[PDB]
Each structure stands twice: as C-alpha cells, then as structure tokens.
Amino acid sequence: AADDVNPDDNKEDFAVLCALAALANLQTTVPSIDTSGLAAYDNLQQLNLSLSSKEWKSLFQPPEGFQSDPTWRKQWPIWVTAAAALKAENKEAAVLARAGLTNAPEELRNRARLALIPLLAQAEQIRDRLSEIQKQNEDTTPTAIAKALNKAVYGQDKETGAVYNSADCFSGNVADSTQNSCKAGNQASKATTVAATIVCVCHKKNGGNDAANACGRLINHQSDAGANLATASSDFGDIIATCAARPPKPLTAAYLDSALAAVSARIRFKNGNGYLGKFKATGCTGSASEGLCVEYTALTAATMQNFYKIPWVKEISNVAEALKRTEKDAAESTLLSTWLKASENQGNSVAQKLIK
Amino acid sequence: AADDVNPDDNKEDFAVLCALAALANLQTTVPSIDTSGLAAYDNLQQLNLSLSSKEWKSLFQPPEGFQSDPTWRKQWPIWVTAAAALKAENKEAAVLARAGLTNAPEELRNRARLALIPLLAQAEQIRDRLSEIQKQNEDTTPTAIAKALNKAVYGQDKETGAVYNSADCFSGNVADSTQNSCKAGNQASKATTVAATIVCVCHKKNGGNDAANACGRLINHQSDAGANLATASSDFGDIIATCAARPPKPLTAAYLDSALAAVSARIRFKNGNGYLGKFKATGCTGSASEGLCVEYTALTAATMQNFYKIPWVKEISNVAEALKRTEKDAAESTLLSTWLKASENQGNSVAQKLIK
Amino acid sequence: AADDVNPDDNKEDFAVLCALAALANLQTTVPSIDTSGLAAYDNLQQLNLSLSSKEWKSLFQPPEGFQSDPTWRKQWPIWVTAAAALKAENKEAAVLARAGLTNAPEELRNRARLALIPLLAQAEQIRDRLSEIQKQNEDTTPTAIAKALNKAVYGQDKETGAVYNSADCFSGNVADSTQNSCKAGNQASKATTVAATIVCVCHKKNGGNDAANACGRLINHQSDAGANLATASSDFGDIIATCAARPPKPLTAAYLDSALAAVSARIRFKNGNGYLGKFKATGCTGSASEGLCVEYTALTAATMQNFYKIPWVKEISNVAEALKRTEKDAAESTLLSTWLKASENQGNSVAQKLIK
Ligand SMILES: *[C@@H]1O[C@H](CO)[C@@H](O[C@@H]2O[C@H](CO)[C@@H](O[C@@H]3O[C@H](CO[C@H]4O[C@H](CO)[C@@H](O)[C@H](O)[C@@H]4O)[C@@H](O)[C@H](O)[C@@H]3O)[C@H](O)[C@H]2NC(C)=O)[C@H](O)[C@H]1NC(C)=O
C-alpha cells in the first residue's frame, strides 16, 4: 500500500496549490504609471497660448481652412484643453508669474513664445509616449487583476466575495463521476479552476477506501465530498482551512510565472496523459487504490501548450503578461514625467535669458 | 507510527529553512545609485560662476538683503561648493578650456552665461531628483542588510560573526519547556529567529522518544539538545552542518519575497493555531508522538498579518522593502546621470554656437 | 529499509532537476535593446551635413591636417555614413522638408545649422551610450543562450537537437563504475551536466537491488541503465519522459538564479562531501542500500564556491549574468531612444523659430 494514496502522499502538490489558491480575493497594488508629466506639458501649452496674439487666441473643430491640416487636427484637443484651463480665475496670471512674464512687453512675449518652439517640439514626443503608456496599461488595475484571479481560483468573475461553489469551480458543475470531473485539457474538460484541482487532489470521498489527509495530516476532514463529489463544498472547506499562503505584495509577473512553472514541473506523464497528484491506476476517482489527482487527458510533452490553455492557467498567465508590461512601462513613465517637469521649468526660465 | 514524527518527516520544511538560514553573515552588493550626474551638475555650476561678473564673484550665509530670498537660500550651498572648487589650482582654467571659453571676450562670456540659463533650469530638477534618490536610499547598504538578516537568522544585530546562541536565538533565552520555547506570534513569543525555528523543527531531544533526523537522514546528531533545549547549541551545529544554501547575488527583493511566500505556503492551520513542522498532538515538544514544530499560537487565516510581525519575518520583509525601492531608484539614477552628463556636454558647446 | 533508497525517495529532488532539464533546446526571446535612437541621431547628422557649406561637403580617412584631430578621428565614420545616406535619391530633399528648410535662404540655413550645435552636443553622449549598450549586449541572443543551456543540460554546444548521449552528458563518457561516474567537483569530475545528474539520482541499475522509481512512481522503467551505466540512455529516456516543466518566457535571470538557489538548498553535507539525492552508505552506486545520488566529493560549506564551478552550474550562471545585464540595459535603451527621437523632432523645429 505505499503505492496506494496514503496520508501526505499529495502534501507537496498541496503546498504549490495553496500558494495558487491564495490568489483569490486579492487586494494588491499595481505598478503606478506616473502621469505627472501630462500636467507639466499642459502647463507649457497654457504658457504658449497665453503668449500668443489676440488673433490666435480668438480661435478658441478647427476653423474653416485648417479642418484638414494634420497638425491642427492633432493639436486641437490639446489647445482646447489649454484654453479652457486658462479661463479659470487667476490661472493666466499664475502661468505668467511662474514664467517671469507678468506685465511683459509685447517684444518679450513674442521672443519668449518663439523660444518655446524647440522646447515644445522636444517635449511633444515625450508627452505622446507617456499618454500612449497610460492608455496601454489602463486595464492593469487591482480590480481587473482580482477578477481574473478569482476566475482562476473559483471560476467567479468578481472582485471579492469569491467562494467555493461546484457550479463555478467545475466547468458546468461536477460530472456524473469523480473520474470525469477530475479531467482537464480534454474534450469535456471539467477541472478548470485551482479550487477544482484542490478538490480532485485532496478530497475525502464517502463510502470508505478514501484517501483522507492525502494533502496533509492537519486537515480535519469533518465530513466528506459525498459520492462523486456531490457535496464537495464542505470537504473543500476543511482542506482550504489549512492553507495560510500569501503572495508577495505588490503582486509581480515574476511570482506568478514562478508559480505556474512550479506546477508544470510537478505534472507527471504516464500512459499518454499528465497527472497532478498521485495516480496508481484506472483514473482520478478519489479511491485510495486508483488515484487522487487531476488527469490532464492526452497531455504530452509536445502538447504541453495545451496546459496553458486550461482556464485557470490562462487567466493567471494573462495577469502575469499584463503585469510584465506594466512593470516596465511604470519604470519608463517615472523618467518621462521627470523630463516633462524639467521642460516646464526650462520654459519658465526663458524670459530671464531674453530680458538679459 | 507514520503519524508520529519520523526521520525525514520535516525534510521539505528544512529545505526552505536552510535557504533562509543562508541569509546569515551575508556579503552582498546592493543596487548602485549612479551619482555621476551630481559631479556633472557641479561642473555646470562652476562654469556659470566662472562666467559671472566680478561683482557676483565677490559674494563668495547669503548677504544682507537676500538672506530671505527662497532662491538664494536654496542655491547658496551649491554656489559655495562651486566657488570653493574653482579656487583650486588650475581648476577655473580647465573649466573654461572645456567650454571653449579660454580668453573669451567679455561679450562672449556674458552671452555664453545667458545661454546657460535654460540649460541650468532644465538640469536643476533632474539634479534635485538624483540628490533625493541618493538620500532616500542611503541606508540600503551591504552592512545594514547584513545586520538585519543576522537579526533574522540568529538574533544578533551585527554585520558578521553571527552564530547560534540560545540567549539571542530565542527571545529572552529558552523557556522552561520546549513546548513554550517553540511558540511564536503569542503573548510570550519565543521562537523569533530562523535559527530558533530550525531548532524547534529539527532538534533531537535527550531522554529517548526523540525525532532525530526529522530534518534529514544525513544529519549526524552527535549529541542532543538536552532536556527542554538546555544544550540546543551543539545539536543545532550538527543540523546546520548539512545546509549548503546560497542566495542569488546580488540579493534581490524578489528572492526574499519568494522565500517568505514559500514559508507562508507551508504553515498549516489546526485547532486555532498554525504549525511549521510536523504536529500530532499536545504541542511542539520534540517528542516523536507529539510534535517537532513551531506553534504559531492563535494564528489563523484572518490573522495571518501577525506572522509578518514575528521578528525574523519583519526583518526580512524590511530588507526586501528597502531593496525593492533601491532597485527601482538605481535604474532611474542611471538615466538621470546620463542626462546630466549630456547637459554638461551641451554647456561646453554653447560658445561654439555664439562665436559663429 | 526506510533508510534504503525506495520509490519516491528522490521525487522532490527530481522536480527541481526537471525544471533545470527543461532549459534544453530552449526557444526564448531576449530583452530588446531599443536602437531606434541610432537612426534618429543619424537623421540629425544628415540634417547638419545638408546645411553645411559646399567647402565642408567637398570633404566627403580625415584629410591632411586633421588626420590627428581627436574630434575628426571620432566623427569621421559618422559623417561618412551621413554623406553616403544623403546621396540616395530624394534623401536630402526629404531631410530638408522634414526640417522646414526646403528652399531656405543661405542666412537661414546657416542660423539653423548653428542652432543644432547644442542639440547635437546634448545628443552625442546619449547616442554614444546607446551604441555602447548595443555592443555590450550583442552576445545575449536566443541562439547563444540556447547553446549554453544545452551545454548545461546535455553537454552539447548546439542550439537545438540536443539529446541524451553519455559521451557528452558525462565528462569523457561514463567511468568504469557508477560510483565514479556519479561524482562532481572533484579531481576526476564526471557528472557535469543536468542530464548526468538525473541519471545518477534516478537510474534503475541492472542486476537487482536497484532503486527503480526513486524519482517517481509514474516512471515506466522499461529497461535499465545496464551495469555501471553502460546503457544509461534508454533508462534516461524513460525518466525524462515524465518531465513536463516549462520555464517562464521570456527567460529571466531571476528564474535561473532561483533554480540554482533551489538546488543549492537541497544539497546535503555528510562525511566531508555533499550529496544530491538519497545517500545511505559507500557511494552513489545505484544500489538501494548504498545511494542514488551525485557525490560532490570534498564539497563543504566553506568550499561551496566549487559547486558553482561545475560545468552545468557555471553555464547557467553565465546565462543568468548575461540576462541580468541585458534586462537593465534594455530598460535604459528605451529611454535613450525616446530621447534621441525627441532631439530629432527638436532639430526639425528650429527653422520655425528662426524664420519667426
Ligand atoms: C504655440 O502657440 C502658437 C500660436 O501663438 C501656435 O502656432 C501655430 O501653430 C500652427 C502649427 O501647428 C501653425 O499652423 C500653420 O499655419 C500655416 C498658415 O499660417 C497662417 O494662418 C495661421 C492661422 O490663421 C496664423 O496663426 C499664421 O500666422 C498664418 O497667418 C500653414 O500653412 C501650416 O501648414 C500650419 O497650418 C500656425 O501658423 C501657428 N501660428 C503662429 C501665429 O505661430 C503653436 O502651434 C503653439 N505650439 C504648440 C506646440 O502647440
């Protein structure tokens, strides 16, 4: 009976699964896109507009004749936002004061505006990159991450309050038999969440000849999963009660990737299938002489990409891919913003040069 | 007796603990804040000062009348450092030569100085950010990290030479009983270091009915831990002798976070407490029929934050948080410095434009 | 016989080894050095050349008199590339059009060129840093990584098609005895690849009293490794057939470092040597009463650096060190390139200022 499923035989599998289950109902921060540079650029646009002729200001759709000019079409919303911001009480005075241009002669206003031309041209692509980053990463949010991870763990597309429910944990609820419920990657794939995987790898079936405590001796299996997982919820509660795992905060792509890699290194191939958990014979039925496992039906080395298409695996992968991008773009945005704030400071100094 | 504590029953716990114990007496490099930009900025300040009027130079506390001017108050130490540096033999000549301003006419000196105004204004916030980074990360040092990690592993706040000593490894030395010494997170928390955790999870008690080799069959337990851990040091020596772990270098936040996450995923909850190591009944006493473990008294899922307040856990967390910041700030500083060096090169070119 | 080598006794060692073996025949992307800034700089050089005098253009070795001028020596290839690019049909017209300098008066051409002086001087060190990064990281390629990792796993310095072959997996082929083949770090070091390590830790010897299934019960050992590993290949095939591991993509330094750290934390020291896999007595012979392991002969805590000199360990370390550098330099290059593109946009705006 060492070859049967005994207490602790799935203990090490359980540790990896526990780490994954701790991704449920997650409250993480995400890497911050530093968008302070956008305000700095807007401030420069407001200075430029303030220093413009009464004819140019009168303009604030581009007007007939420029409706089709590619520069006017791109700049219009930017100019419109600047004009609107400038209308606010004391805002133009403040803009001019910061620039050293309060009560400036017209000669100086014009020279100062012209001086801004290269500065604005240098800042434009920096600002446009920052605005692109912002847009590209706008779905990397704590909420979106939490929902995707709750789909992975519990099959529930919600930010919080996710709980074990077989209707969600197994795709279309539990099958007619445990053997069929504990299959994934196959034509009738059922064990499509981390929680279903835990049930398959750890449950105590009713009726005797069970593998109670396969996932650890500290589980208090107070009930059982019924026959054919009919009442898996009570048993899952007892199993998951033993899990204390917490992921690092903020959550990183690297951590998620390491967790998926850890699972992949535990799956074992036999007879044309892959298995997570102890498999002896027949199938993943919850019987001690058979197996307490997930059967990745027809999974093989050359078809391992199919593991990554299983819903929980795909959801976690999507989150990691989003975080991988956002981590880099956040670091880039720090510098873009600092540079734009520096351009704003430069624009505020040009009058000093020109007076002198 | 499979449910008793047998040889190897804590082997996998030991591997994770070994990785943590290898953080003792650590000699790591830390991410470098690239401060070369500060010198570049100083060089620009020296050029600006060199090109100033004899009246401005005569000034080198701001003088009566400017003592309260916010710009003079901020710039004074910078200007003072520039003036001091310029006094050094041949330094002003070298500054002027690099700028193409040796023997420059007064007209050109003045125009060149004015040209510097926007350049200096752009560089100022870049330099101030770099100086802020430097200050914010000045305690992320190999020494500070080593001391915090030695507190974590051995309870000894020192850079090197940390060793097992029960007076330090257990908070206030060992308790009256093993059961009480092998508790953490509770009103009389004792097992507050990684080394105490290893003792609790791995020791061979005297008097028979011990769990020798729970942490691995290659341990040569040549002695024992005494009764109630009275002579734990000799036994700890034999246990730790089997540990070969090395962390990656340079040490990273990610690695530390992964190690704490790995421990968290191993702690098992039963009867209102958490346990690391095999627990059967009664307590973590070192007796084979009872347990060889740490009891995280009253630890539960909803109170898991309390695990992170345990001294060794907090120390490692602090180190990881420091490294997480410094990794990012180091990457930012690379670009800040390159930009400041480029500004210096730009300042050295303005005379060529103005001559022509 | 719990102290003998039984089925599953090396299962956890095998999971870590499987993760390492999955580095064979790897197809990863590497962090991209963003070199778009180099083209941007070239465009600026072409604008500068276009705006130069017919005397300066006539020049396109520096000419007699400037052959030794440090500026001319550095700039010559850059200027030569610019002149060559400008000769291409319509290229000069396009350069001038982008700059607003089509049909520009000579006065404006000259003023515009002079305006470029500080811009080019600021861009020069940014471009030179980017070109340095490019050169420093030019061997961090998918091909080079794949070859080094195939040396690590299979001892075959090739990009793809690496397979088990004892002539390559063991240094100089298998030794006269398993005990001697399963040694590393010593005067006659043999087990110098991950695959040799797997053979040593997992093989089924012929002749009875073997430790079949030490690395897991799902292995179908259809044959055996012969006597003294004489036919290890067939047996290795059956063992590795059970391994499904995939590393994260793109491959990271952190992942590689974590994998080497994981192995280091598993090696156990006894009797002056280190061991990976279960060791009871005598040596790593494949006999159940002796050991199924690699013997790191004379490895000790103070000599653990010697583990990192073992060929597979060194190869993976080299890859991680290369990736660690390239990850950082890639992130730096993103900003260098954005800045150079912004300088190009600035250069294209100077005529607008000067006309006005
Ligand atoms: C900063 O404020 C400036 C105004 O003070 C903005 O300058 C305007 O910028 C656009 C380029 O996007 C130029 O558009 C060109 O216009 C000519 C035709 O110019 C004539 O008509 C306009 C409109 O009545 C008038 O403003 C001019 O003086 C001329 O009478 C076209 O042939 C080009 O294709 C292009 O459309 C404007 O000419 C220019 N105006 C002035 C007065 O400089 C500037 O864009 C602001 N900067 C930024 C970055 O937003």
Ligand SMILES: *[C@@H]1O[C@H](CO)[C@@H](O[C@@H]2O[C@H](CO)[C@@H](O[C@@H]3O[C@H](CO[C@H]4O[C@H](CO)[C@@H](O)[C@H](O)[C@@H]4O)[C@@H](O)[C@H](O)[C@@H]3O)[C@H](O)[C@H]2NC(C)=O)[C@H](O)[C@H]1NC(C)=O
């Ligand atoms: C580069 O070197 C310059 C000197 O060659 C520095 O310029 C000085 O910078 C401060 C701004 O921080 C200006 O302070 C203003 O001063 C006026 C009063 O100015 C009169 O008095 C000063 C002192 O006797 C004299 O230098 C001026 O010519 C005037 O006679 C105040 O009303 C302002 O609130 C502010 O305090 C200096 O005026 C300015 N001096 C000159 C000659 O330009 C410059 O700061 C250095 N750049 C950097 C970045 O450090």
Ligand SMILES: *[C@@H]1O[C@H](CO)[C@@H](O[C@@H]2O[C@H](CO)[C@@H](O[C@@H]3O[C@H](CO[C@H]4O[C@H](CO)[C@@H](O)[C@H](O)[C@@H]4O)[C@@H](O)[C@H](O)[C@@H]3O)[C@H](O)[C@H]2NC(C)=O)[C@H](O)[C@H]1NC(C)=O
């Ligand atoms: C942008 O294009 C410019 C040409 O339009 C390039 O300017 C040339 O740049 C080099 C600096 O690397 C200067 O070299 C100096 O030359 C003087 C001697 O100058 C006299 O002879 C040259 C050659 O016949 C002639 O071009 C000058 O007008 C003078 O008659 C030396 O004493 C210095 O040590 C140094 O060698 C050139 O003078 C300069 N030429 C002009 C016309 O400005 C410029 O380098 C290009 N920019 C970049 C970044 O590539």
Ligand SMILES: *[C@H]1O[C@H](CO)[C@@H](O)[C@H](O)[C@H]1O
């Ligand atoms: C588990 O239960 C099945 C179903 O009765 C039985 O066939 C096995 O022998 C038992 O271990």
Ligand SMILES: *[C@H]1O[C@H](CO)[C@@H](O)[C@H](O)[C@H]1O
């Ligand atoms: C460990 O030691 C205790 C104390 O004598 C005993 O109660 C247990 O039965 C033994 O295993």
Ligand SMILES: *[C@H]1O[C@H](CO)[C@@H](O)[C@H](O)[C@H]1O
């Ligand atoms: C493994 O094989 C060796 C060689 O015959 C023997 O000495 C051991 O007793 C056996 O377990």
